[PDB]
Structure formats: C-alpha cells, structure tokens
Amino acid sequence: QPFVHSPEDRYQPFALTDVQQAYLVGRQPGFALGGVGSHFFVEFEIADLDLTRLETVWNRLIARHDMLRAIVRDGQQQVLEQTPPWVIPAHTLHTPEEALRVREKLAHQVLNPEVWPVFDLQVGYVDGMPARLWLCLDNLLLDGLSMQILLAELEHGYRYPQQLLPPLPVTFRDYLQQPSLDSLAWWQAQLDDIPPAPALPLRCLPQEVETPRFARLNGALDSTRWHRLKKRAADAHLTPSAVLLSVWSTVLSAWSAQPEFTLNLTLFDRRPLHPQINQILGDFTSLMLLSWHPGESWLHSAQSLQQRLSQNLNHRDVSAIRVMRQLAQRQNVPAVPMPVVFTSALGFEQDNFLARRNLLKPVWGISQTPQVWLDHQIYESEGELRFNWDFVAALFPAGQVERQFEQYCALLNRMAEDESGWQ
Template sequence: TEPSIDLAAADVRRWLDERLPGHMVPEQFAVLDELPLTSNGKVDRAAVAAGPWWAEEQSEDEVAPPQGRMEELLGDLWLEFLPVERVTRTDNFFRCGGDSLIGTRLVARLGSVGVEGAELRGLFANPTLAGFAATLDFGATSAARFVAEPDARHDPFPVTDVQQAYLLGRRPEFTLGGVGCHFYVEFDSADVDVARLEQAWNTLIARHDMLRAVFDETGQQRVLATVPGFAIPVTEVAADEAEPALTRLRTEMSHRLFDPAQWPLFDVRAVRYGQRVRLGVGLDNLVLDALSVLILFTELNLLYDDPQAVLRPVGVTFRDYQMNTRPDPGELAAAREYWSSRLDRLPPAPDLPLAVDPVHITAPRFLRRQLHLDREHWGVITKRAREHEITPSALLLACYAEVLGAWSGRPDMTLTLTTFRRQEVHPDINNILGDFTSLLLVAYEPEPGTGLAARARALQEQMWRDLDHQAVSATWVLREMARRAGLAETSMPVVFTSALGVLDGLDTTAAADFAWGISQTPQVWLDHQVREYADGLAVNWDHVEGLFPPGVIDQMFGAYQAALDWLATGDWSAPLPVSGPARDIAPVSR
C-alpha cells in the first residue's frame, strides 16, 4: 500500500504560491482520501465539482485577520474600496469585487501615503491581501501633500493630452474631423418645473469651475470668474403636435459643435408638450468626462428636489489637479521606454469591412445600437467573472474583441480603451467636474486553442501592465507611431468605454426618465460604451453613419448580444461561439 500523505490546504496553497502566478492559485482546496470515479475508471469531474467537501470549514490561515502594519493598512483600504464587510489574509482582490478602476485607486492611495512597490501588475500577480502586502514596503517619507491654490483658480493652465486631441481632432482637415467630442441625452418626464431646473443649473455653474471654462488658441484653458445667468429655453406645443418640435430639438442638439472659446460649452433646452417635458442636454467632453456627467446629473436631481440640499464638498479644482499631478521625470522616462518597446509589436486596429474610405466622410454623424441586461442576468455574469478572477470590464472587452475579430482579417488587434483616472490626491477629488479622461492602447492577442476565460485573463494582465505606464498617454504613442511610419496622422479608431465601477455614491435611477442619447468623437469609427444602472446593464455601440456596409453593425451587435447571453451559462474554458459575417460583406480597399 502507498504511504498516506498528511496534507493541509494551507500547505498546498503555499506550494502553489511559490510556483504559479497569483491569479492561477485556486481559491478553495479540499483534501480527499480518494477521487470519485466513473464506471470506466476515469475521474468523475461532475461528482468532484458537486461534492460536499467545498463546504468544509476553512483553515485557521484562511480566516486569519491581517497581520502586521502593511497588511492592516491594506485591510483598511480593502474595506474602503471593495464591497466587503470583513477581510482576511487570504481574501482575493478579484473575488471580493475588485476591478482595474479600484486597483488604480488602491495603488494611488498607497503611493500617497509613502508605500513603495505598489503597481497594478503586482496586484494582478499577487491578488491575495497577504500576497500583495508582501510585495510592498514603507518608504522613508510620505508623498508630498497636495495643496489647492484658490487664488489662482482663474489663471490659464495647460490642456491635457486628451483635451488637446479633442481640440485638434475637431478640425475638418483631419479624417473624420469636423465634430467635437460631444455627449447628448434626452430625458422625458411629466410635470417638470423648468424654472426650478434652471435654478439648479445655475447653482451648479457657480459651484463647479469647469462649467465656466473656455479655451484659447494658445492651448490654454481658463475658468471665467463670472458668467451671465443661464436660461433654459422652452418650446410650448400641444401634445398632438409634439413630433415636429421633438425632431427639431434632436436635430439641432444631438451633433452640435461648440466653439471652445465661447461660454457655455453645454446646451440645455426643453419642449413642453401637454403635461410632459422633453429635456435635451448637450455637453462638450472638453470640460466633462463620463464620471463628471454622472456627478452633474446626480447633483442636478438633488438640487431640483431640494434647492437647499447639502452637496459633497469641492475643496479642490480641476486646475489644482492638473498643476499638481504631472508625472515626475523618472516615471515619464520609464513609461516612454515601455511604450517605445511595444510600438513595433502592437497589432493593427481591427480591419473591419467599410462601405467607404473614412477620408471621404466630411461631416460625420453617429448612430446608436443599444441593449439592456436585467439585473439578474448581469448578476450571474459578474458572479462567474469573480470566480474566474476576471473583472467585468475585462470580460466585456474580450467579448467585444472576439466579435470584432470575426469581422476582421485577423483575430489580434489594438483597441483604444477610455479610462477615468483620478489620482486620490485630495479627499474631494471624486466630487469635482473636469475631463480626467485617459486613453490607453490595449492589444488583444488571443492564444490559439484557448478558451474565453484564459483569453480574458491574458487581456486583463496586459491591460494592467499598460495601466502601470499611463504617465505616457495613447495620444503620445499614436504620434510616435505616425512619426516612425512617416505619416501625417494615425489612429486606433475602435474604442471601448466602460463606466463600470465609477457609480459609487451616485444616482443610478435617472434611467427611468431616459428617452434617447448619442455620443460622437472625432477620428472614431465605433465606440462600445457600458454602464450599470439600478436595474441592470446598459450597452451602447455608437458608430459613424454610412461608414460600414449595410447590415454589418447589426450583425456584429447581434453577435455581441448573443455572446452576453452565452456568458450566463456557457463553458468559459471553451472559445466564445461567434457567428461569422455574411459572405457577401468585404472591406473596401483603403
């Protein structure tokens, strides 16, 4: 007989920790005297998965609280950032609901208190609390304290790389230029008091500096000290005569191009028809990113309900942030070296079939496809994602890339990822408005023969390595690519924008009055957008009208919706099943 081996789950975990990346170490262990077998003598995998051993009590190591100064600091931050009520040394960041946004905030907070070695790729490789703590050290001194400059709030200050790209990209000489980066939405509700809403808008204009911002020709932005009172024009029509007025509202507002030198860089209009009001809101993303829009609408609802409502403090400005958070020379040099080494290895953008060459579209207009997953369906997907240690955003991005790959000439591609990075340098930083947008080029390079879970994890790991080098923006990388290729311009025009995880503390019920929306961005062909509401998940695909052959967007979007349905019950160890394009669709030469 074979000698018995006395193993404890903690022993197995330690042995695997020494040999495997953290995300590959199982969350649960069970020691069995023998494995259940099928009638033909093979391991009965179904019986193993269903066995009662997974409910056994955890070992002392698995329920131990954080130990030591670093683990205790991490434990406090996990309680603050993650949706958990208690933490142990073996808790896994992903299984506790962590994602790239929370990871970025966690790493930034650690740096702000003088912790050295905090990087996203380190968290990915060591996702347990104790494992990540072991990679960190307390520095000799804490980081410099952020200081607001209220006396300089109206002085000019430089635009960000993304703001500069938005300003240049709207010029008609650029491919798919002539449009601004614009967000438009319509709300429809009964018995709206427009005068009360107007008062709320003016309160927010006085409260938030970037609602009074303008831009000059030298590449500077500044906040106006005073502006005239903002009025919301109202068109009154009978209920049975509303359609022409509502159509005119959408036509005039949905694709508006603001003059960045003229205030305001937003527009609000109303149509009252019978007892209902349709409200159109257009915003230039030069001054507001996606999180800022959510903050704006949340505060607008609060002030409309109660003009005396106490809002969260804003003891810092967007100008303060921009003037005090520039990367140090060492960080910038390291990021440039990283991206320079990746330039020649980045796959091209998706080679999607086009109806015309983009250079021939001189006045781009955008159309939208949208879908909604109910709360239960989305909950099943997010639960499975946590079990596979994949963030929901990375999972959706992988599915998006798989669908795009089916319509492209090759499965690998580079996509532009929109991120909302706010370094936590001040307690009020998540309360203010501004364009904190960062753009990241992410390569999707699926390994042949692997399943969706493995591909999504590999994509997630690559994305987190890239996020550690965001001191250099995607716009710098694109300029460097164009310089090396001897081109006037280059772009990665297929975009993925995720607002998952940015809604903490914000109103997610406004969708009840949502009527219609569209976004537009210069040099973009297709933008996948996703955000959560109280009742589930909303996905939009905004694309340039007339750029793709008839039926292509509908086919791809249908395949993507089928992929989201499959995620709830499919085997993630297998490839994602994607129906290919129709045979008669082929890309134009360009």
Template sequence: MDISRLEQAWNTLVRRHAELRSVFTPDGRQQFLPSDQTVLHVPHTQLDATTAPEAVNQELDTLRDRLSHRVLDPGRWPLFTVEAVTYHQLGQQRTRVGIGLDNIILDGLSMMIVFSELEELYRDPGASLPERELTFRDYRVQVEPSDTQLRADRQYWQERLDSIPPGPQLPTLVDPDTVTQPRFRRWQRRIPAETWKAALQNARHLGLTPAVVLLSSYAEVLGRWSTSSEFSVNVTLFDRQEVHPHIDRILGDFTSLLLVEIRTRPGDTRGVRAIRLRDQLASDLEHRSVSAIWVQRELARRRGAVAGASVVFTSGLGLGTAMSLDPGPGFPDRIWGISQTPQIWLDHQVSQTPDGELVIQWDAVEGLIAAEAIGSMFDEYARLVSAIADPGWADSRPGLPAASASHLAQPASSPQGPVSIRGESSPVAEAGKPRPGVESTVARIWEELLGSTGIDRVADFFGLGGDSLVATRMVARVRAEVGIELSLREFFADPTIAAVAATGMGPHGGQMQAGTEDFEEGEL
C-alpha cells in the same frame, strides 16, 4: 416640469462648479470664468393644446436633431446645452428636455455628479450639497508624473512601437477620409440582472474583472469582422488619483486612453484569451502616464501615416452605485442618447443600472460601415456577453457557441508556459487577522479605501467590493506608506493583504483566491 426651477438649479451648479464655467483658449489652456459672467438661460418652446400631433413631432425631432450633433466652440461659454419643449399629448401636458454635455470638461463620473446634484437642487433649491475643497485646476496643477516615471513609460512604449498593430480593418462603405461631418447612430441592449450576476461569478472565478471579460468579447466580435485577427483598440481609463478626500466630488475630464493590442492564438479558449488580455492590461497600466495619443503620434511618425485605432472601448462599471446618468423620479425619463467622438468609427460603452441590469451600447458613424453589419456585430456581441454566464464559457472556443463547446475545449498554453487560472491549487496563506507591522498597515489602507472593517488577511480584494480603479489607488498608497514596489500584475495574481505584505519580503507564490461577493470596476 417647471423650467424656471430647472434653470435655477442649473445656475446653482454653475456657481458651485468652476468647471462648468470653463472655456479653452486658442493655445489649449482651460480658463475659468467668473460666476457673474456665466448665467444660463434655458430656451423653452411652448406648444399649446391645439398644436397638431404632426407639428409636435416635428418640433421634438428638430430639438433632437439640433442638439444631438451640435459641435460646441470650446472658446465660447457654455460648453453644455439645455433646451426644453412643452407640448400636449393625450390630454396631458408634457415636457421634453434636451441636454448636451461636452466631454472636454466632463468625464463619465462628472456627468453622474451633475445629474445627481441637479436632481437634488431641482427637488430642493436650498439643498446643502457635499463640501468640496478641491477643483479640477488644483488637481491638474498638483498631479503630474515624475520625470523618471515619464522616461520609463516612454521607453516601455518605444520598445513596442514596431509590434503594435493598427486598428481593426472593418468593412467600410466609403473611404473614412471622405466623412467630414460624421453623424452617429446608437445600438443598445440590456442584459438581465440575473444573467449579468452569473457572468460576474464566472469572471470572478478566473480572477477577471467585468470589463476584461467584456473587452475580450468585444475583441472577439471585432476579430471576426476585421481583415486581420491582430489589431489595437483604444480603451478609456478613468484615472482620478487619490490626492484628496473630495476627489470624487469634483467635475473634470480625468480620462485618458490606453492602446491595447489584441492578438489571438489558434486553439485558445475564451478563458485563456481573457486571462492573457488581463495580464497585458496589468502590464500596460503600470505605464499609463504615456497616453494612447502620444503612442499613436509616435506610430504615425515612424510609419509615415496615421496608425491609430478608430475603435474605442469604454466601461462605466464601478464609477459609483449612488449616482447614475438616469434621472430620478422628479425628472422626465431618459428616452434617447448619443455620443460623438472625432476620428472614431465605433464607440463601445457599458454601464450598470441600480437594479443590476447591464446596459451595453454602441455609437457608430452612419454610412461608414453598413448599418446591417453593425447590427449583426452588435447582436453577436450581446449573445457573447450573455454567454459569459454559462458554466462552460471559459473552456469554450471562439467560433463555437459558448454554451455548447465546453466539452471540446482544454486549457491552452502560451510559449511562455501555461496561463494561470484562478482557483488552481497553490500555496495558501493562513486565514486570520492581519499580523502586526506591514500587514496591519496594508489592512488599514484597505479599510479606508473599501469602507470595510475587520478584513481577514486572506480576504479577496475584489470579493470585498474592490475594483481595479481602487486597486490602482491602493498600490500607490502601499508604495508611499509602506515602501513596497507592488505592480498591478502582481496584485491581480493574488489580491490579499498577506500577499501584498509578502511582496515586500521577497518572492511569493499563490494564485488568486476566489472571492465571495460580486465586484465592479471602472478603470480596467
């Protein structure tokens, strides 16, 4: 690998993206430095062919150990790290590159953009990259929730503070407060593409997004190992609001956290649990202008102790199929990775490869929870994810093998009445072209967001390739352009153009209609 060419590509990115030139002042403000003050030099260690294999391995281990748990000073540039070691193995010259990125400036999609553009610039230093008229600073200055929305959302969470449970009480080896310099270890598994495709079909039949069925399985495992079956999980949201055509080309940290309650009821099937979780998420997402950080501070103030959830769920599904964290053929293979987050015990991450495999990984603090326990939890989770593909998954009950329990289970009801499952009989709108007026306007919005044309008025939004990140944008545009006050929960209940238009004309019935294509999602 040509390190000088790699360095040139990085510096082109630094000049292009002000976000890569940012630092933070002591009072927390993000500051963007001029490009002539931010020239990156890539440290490059070169080992000749006579270097002993033991010395080579030691150098590579040192690189990994040094970069994997480096904590960067947010006040000093750069807030990312690139280093390289060239060595010889089996008669061939090889290069290992270590890259560390700080989430304070880059979210998941931003990292994908960085690697995609880096690969293109390495292959062709003169490559013409997509135009971008917006910066992260522009976005933050312009996009703020209204005072009315902020008050309503705070009221929503204030009314729930007394009932929100703490994080899962997992078996720890030591007092978490004694872990002052945490080091993380990763567990990773790949679910075959065919298995994941079948799981998506089962989820779609119930009107569930991929991340909801994964979160439900994650919560099931946590519940088995926690001392309480009621707990909260921090869910990462990727919330780039559709304020500019170039919004998906800029870098920045667009993430926020949502504190999600996990409550189980005896006799619930896995399908019922997932549907209840979906409905809870839909309600919570309507009030996401207030982050989990604010909620946890209020909880600490009210309860006199830190009551946050130390377990995180992050889904990278639906962030884009054209980009990936995996490098292209012009780069070395990605062979190892780790993430570290302050005050977090366990971080769940999931993504999908271009060929359809599902990649699940857990990063956990070493020495806090026994490695054997984490390993057992992870193996159990991987089995549960694979079991979603089984035809009897929805009717199976936790504690029984998903593949064998379907004949024992019957759909359960909540105190508020039965949980609706997509696919049950309900009034169905007539198929055909969108009708003039509201339906035509909604159809145009769908076409612009989904990149499709000629959408039927009863076509399923998620079956057309939509996800709940795009659904959030769609709801916002429908409110702005049509004046319909549509909630995400209402939309999830019937994701069709006809149902959206009917919302503006009064109450309407109907369940979600089964889609015909696979779908992905990023934000829950």
C-alpha cells in the same frame, strides 16, 4: 504630498490636457475622419416639469462647478468668474413629431468652445405629453465620470431643491498643477507587438466623410446575469472589464480583415491627490492601448488580454496619444489611428446612475468623439450593466453595426447563462 491650492489664480488661464488638445484639433479633417465636435447629448422626459425649479438647480450647479464656467481661449482653458445666469429656453410643441425636429437640431449642434457657455440646455413642452429636456455637455471640458457626477446632482437637486451643498474644496485647475501630473521605455519596447486597429469593412473612405454624424445602439445585461457573469469572470481569473472586452473583441475579430487588433481604452480614474477629488468636474481621461491576440480558446484569449491589461494599466502615465505617435514613427507612416474605442465607467461608485424611477427620465442620447468610428461605452446601474455603441453610421455597410451588436448581445447573454463557452 499635500495638495497645493492656488485660489488667487483660480480664474487664470491654464494648459489644456493632451486629450483636450486632441479634441480641439479633431474639429478639423484628420487621418481617420472628417472634423467633428466632442459633445454628449441627452434627451430626458419630465412629467409635470417645473421650469423655475429646474432653472434654480441648474444655475446652482453652474456656480458650484468651475468647469461649467470654463472656455477655451488663446490655446488654453480658463474659468470665468461670473457668467450670466442661464435662462432656460422653452419651446412649445404641439406634436411629438415637432419635438423630434427640435431634438435633431440640438443633438447635432456645434458648441463653440471659445464663447461661454460650452453647453446647451433647453426644454420643450409637448401638448398632453411629458416635457422634454435637451442637455448638451462637452467632453472637451467634462469627462464621462464628470458627466455622471453632474447628471446625478441635477436629478438630486430637482428632486430635493431645498438641499444646499457646501462649496467644493478643490478645483480641476489646481489638480492639473500638482507636481505628480521609464514608462516611455516600456512602451517603446513593444512597438513591434501592437497590431493596427480593427480592419472592419467600410462603405467608404473615412477621411471622405465630411460631416461625421454619430448614431447609437444601446442595450443592457439584467442584474441577475451581470452578477452571474462577474462571478464567472472571477472564477476564470478575469476582471469584468476583461470579460466584456474579450466578448466584444470576439465579435470584432469575426468581422475584421485580420483577427488580431488594438483597441483604445478610455479610463476615468483620478490620482488620489485630494480627499474630494472624485467629486469635481473636469478632464481626467487617460487613454491606453490594448491588443487582442486570439488563441485556441476564448478563455486563453481572454486570459492573455487580462495579463496585457494588468501590465498596461501600470504604465498609463504614457498616453496612448504618445504611443500612437511612437508607432507611426517606428512604422514610417504619417499616423497610426485607433478609431475603435472601449470606454468604461465601471467602479466609480455612481450606483443608481439614471435609476429607473428618476424624475429626469433619459429617453434618447448620442455622443461624439473626433477621429473615432465606434465607441463601446459601459456603466453599471441598479445592478445592471448598461452599454451603448456610438458610431459613425455612414462609415459602415448597411446593417453591419446592427448585426455586430446583435451578435454581441447574444454572446454576452449566453456566456452569462451557459458555462460551456468558458472552456
């Protein structure tokens, strides 16, 4: 079907996605966590920052991407035609300690989605040190792939400020309006075979965390080992995502009260309704449950997970949001939460995202998701697999997440080197 553009309605309100609605209500106390926002925060270091150049690039991106000018208003989303140019606030800091105090303030700020802008961008000059760029974007409006697109454009524009990009020919607003946007029956069919989320040890009731604060652990698998592990995956009839999911679930099983459990998978692939759809910013998130049922050998367990994954992917028009409701109705409980999440940006041609030699050098970051305890996020860059776990640190016993991360990194590396554990 041909894409239907409605430029005369470009600035009219439009409906929020299911994911966006969940984020907004996740600002309030819920079944699995206190209220929290949904933003993504990164600190970059820039040698010899040219503020005027950065401001030009950023304002071009605001003009280029409708969803940077979006707000939530009267229960819907809306793109603002004209917004005041962003004049970047700059702080003068005399020590790295002073800059850390600013980072801490900005990384945990609350973006009000009702008042433009639903982002923040400030800089900090530190005497005799690289300047800092503190960037805050909201997953309420820009999904993970959108944030990779936008950050790559920000790097590219700052490096090559003379290049002008032609306007985008398709909008997120119009995408959501397309017609294309028994799967429900297929999901209802196996409500009895979806086990609860991982029953991980907690140091308190998660509902009793009034102001959840996220922390991050990050790692990488070097490009030689990641190539080798992808090859071994192929030889064992597993996608790379299935291998990573199975390695992670092995660690989670070892800590959980029950060895079988369900994860919520966050995916970003877009329906191919316009040839340039992968170039725009918006919320294209899909959520999909996937259960881990360990068997005799890791390999058998991974192969069962891959088969389940392949089938489930065929039914993502029914969201995990809906399935969790069906699960709670079937089980006669108020809610069935899925607070342990796996988020994959593999496969989206964002090669060399955050490439080592980037002028905007990422040095620190954190992300929040309401009603989530632990989010394992992955992406590929410069041939390496890069990953981070974002988690509510206060929920878990001291040292627990750090130890699980240590075990996960060790197992990942060993399985990339050592053929033994592939049965």
